[PDB]
């Protein structure tokens, strides 16, 4: 009935001159294993070593030398750390983007394959190693649709195993399957898949970030009409937000003793002193991390630097609110992802990376034994997208759909009204996909 039709999920169903883009002193083991498997199907391997945060202009000129090239594999995201900093700094994100941009500049007309190490986890037995490499998958999905010519696809591999590469890769790069989102494992090879889904109550205080703005504003007043005791709405503007006055009044009406606080979810301190400010009498029971990112444009120009900087509220807010609730017993920890991480549409390159992180963090939370929820939203309330298949969901329709998603206590539920007839043809117009097969 109504909601069921717009509820989906990711599964992983089983189905089956080159350059190697690699960092100096990184992947070595996986680069030699890649080279062996590649020439074993008749193709000269030559290494393309990359500098940390490469200038696309200098890389363009190093590709205008090597001569005719039939393809290029990337081990940038292989054997990588995350030096105790911002999750979407990740050199390999900044450099996949400046690599792709530079190939297109150097006019190779050959595609690019990015491999990642346990970025995906094919069902709830495997773990997500580093949620950031998920960003590679998001952005990579929206590069496909903006420039088919240059994007081969993504291929996830167990943390530190060259073995799965060695047999399959030959196939994956030349295979006529039309699989571009693959996961290699010991128990065979798996493909990324979109499928439809099968058929809670708030307590103490429940905190919502973005709570003074729209979306968070609807979550705030949904949470009250669903009978919440106490609501802590936070945002950079807090009480000084336009209509924050008429908001508390509107849901103080609906039996909710709510408070509106200024807070920079990006700053470890600003939230610590927000969490230490909730009365002992009314403890913190659930969070709804709805803080937004706003970065439009195309993958033409978009850089790792722009993504990282424009996504902090959503991303650092997640990593902060996770960090500072890990040792507290709370009901729901609800991250707001979107259809940009789910399938990814032209001009959502600025949104995909951030929501990919949120997707990964929930997975690796319920993995570690914590109550996470990574809702991949479609469009919401008040022309170019209404035509291309995706149509707006009313606030209440979306919220009620969340109500069940928590009842089930699913980790990564997709929630989106999609008129499929137009959407498929609009999504495949320029590049064939095998993702929506099972509908």
């Amino acid at each position, epitope marked *: 009935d109504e909601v069921s039709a717009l509820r989906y999920r990711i599964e992983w169903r089983p189905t089956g001159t080159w350059l190697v883009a690699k960092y100096a002193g990184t992947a070595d083991e996986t680069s030699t294993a890649a080279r062996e498997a590649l020439e074993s199907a008749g193709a000269r391997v030559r290494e393309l070593v990359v500098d940390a945060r490469c200038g696309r202009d200098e890389l363009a000129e190093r590709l205008r030398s090597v001569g005719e090239v039939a393809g290029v594999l990337s081990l940038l995201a292989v054997d990588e750390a995350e030096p105790e900093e911002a999750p979407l700094a990740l050199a390999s994100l900044a450099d996949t983007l400046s690599l792709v941009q530079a190939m297109v500049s150097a006019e190779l007309g050959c595609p690019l394959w990015t491999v990642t190490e346990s970025a995906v986890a094919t069902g709830p037995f495997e773990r997500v190693r580093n949620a950031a490499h998920g960003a590679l998958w998001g952005v990579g999905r929206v590069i496909a649709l903006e420039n088919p010519a240059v994007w081969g696809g993504l291929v996830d591999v167990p943390a530190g195993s060259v073995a799965e590469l060695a047999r399959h890769l030959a196939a994956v790069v030349s295979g006529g399957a039309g699989e571009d989102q693959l996961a290699l494992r010991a128990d065979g090879v798996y493909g990324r898949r979109w499928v439809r889904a099968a058929a809670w109550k708030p307590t103490g205080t429940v905190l919502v970030t973005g709570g003074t703005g729209g979306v968070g504003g609807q979550i705030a007043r949904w949470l009250a009409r669903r009978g919440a005791p106490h609501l802590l709405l936070v945002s950079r503007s807090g009480p*000084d937000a*336009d209509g924050a006055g008429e908001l508390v009044a509107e849901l103080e009406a609906l039996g909710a003793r709510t408070t509106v606080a200024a807070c*920079d979810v990006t700053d470890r301190e600003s939230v610590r002193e927000l969490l230490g400010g909730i009365g002992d009498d009314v403890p913190l029971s659930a969070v709804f991390h709805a803080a937004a990112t706003l970065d*439009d444009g195309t993958v*033409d120009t978009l850089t790792g630097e722009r993504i990282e900087r424009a996504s*902090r509220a959503k991303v650092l807010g997640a990593r902060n609110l996770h960090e500072l609730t890990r040792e507290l017993d709370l009901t729901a920890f609800v991250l707001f992802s979107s259809f940009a991480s789910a399938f990814g549409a032209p001009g959502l390159g*600025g949104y995909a990376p951030g929501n990919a992180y949120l997707d990964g963090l929930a997975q690796q939370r319920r993995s570690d034994g914590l109550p996470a929820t990574a809702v991949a939203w479609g469009t919401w309330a008040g022309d170019r997208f209404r035509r291309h298949g995706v149509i707006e969901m009313p606030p209440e329709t979306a919220c009620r759909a969340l109500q069940n998603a928590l009842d089930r206590a699913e980790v990564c539920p997709i929630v989106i009204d999609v008129r499929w007839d137009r959407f498929l043809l609009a999504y495949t117009a320029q590049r064939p996909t095998r993702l929506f097969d099972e509908i």
Partner: antibody
Amino acid sequence: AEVQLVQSGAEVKKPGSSVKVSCKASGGTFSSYAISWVRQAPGQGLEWMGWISAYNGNTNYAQKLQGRVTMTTDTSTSTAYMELRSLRSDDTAVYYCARAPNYGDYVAFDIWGQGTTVTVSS
Amino acid sequence: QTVVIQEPSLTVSPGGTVTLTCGSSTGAVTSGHYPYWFQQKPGQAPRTLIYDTSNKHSWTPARFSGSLLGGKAALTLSGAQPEDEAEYYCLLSYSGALWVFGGGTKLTVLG
């Protein structure tokens, strides 16, 4: 960086009329960026007016303006326009456009127009 | 309605260091407020010296520096020169794609 912005020449207006100031963006790609506008009354501070998206024509306006200001982009001429209706005397100011440099943020103020002086008087 | 306060005016001697601050009425200015620093010599348009609390452009002189000093944003001029006589504006990012400028500091360098 080597993105410049060049604005319309000076304008003099009477109360109740309109002004459409232009900001043409040469020297780099135009499409993946928001042009932001700011004004400054004689010998007073910079005030934020709003931003127009060159990507999807979206707009956020300063409340005190809403209903009097319209920001538009011409992807063709690679220029942004700011248009202020029903002017009164306190709308006298120098109006500035600003955006990111060449591989910079969406809503940014790194690069500035040269300004357009608009005088409104009886 | 958020108000951003700078010192109206400050005077430094050549070689001196002077430190401007940018507070907000709504709370602690912090790096999610994406503080910018702008310089406006008389007759001219703003030039931008600092973005993202502390990042310099190539045209920013070394002697300028952006920081968070206890709840405000801070620009610090070290070994000031006559050519730095200017108005300095800070700009902060809030809420629903809102931005609010400080009133400016008139920095005088005694030449």
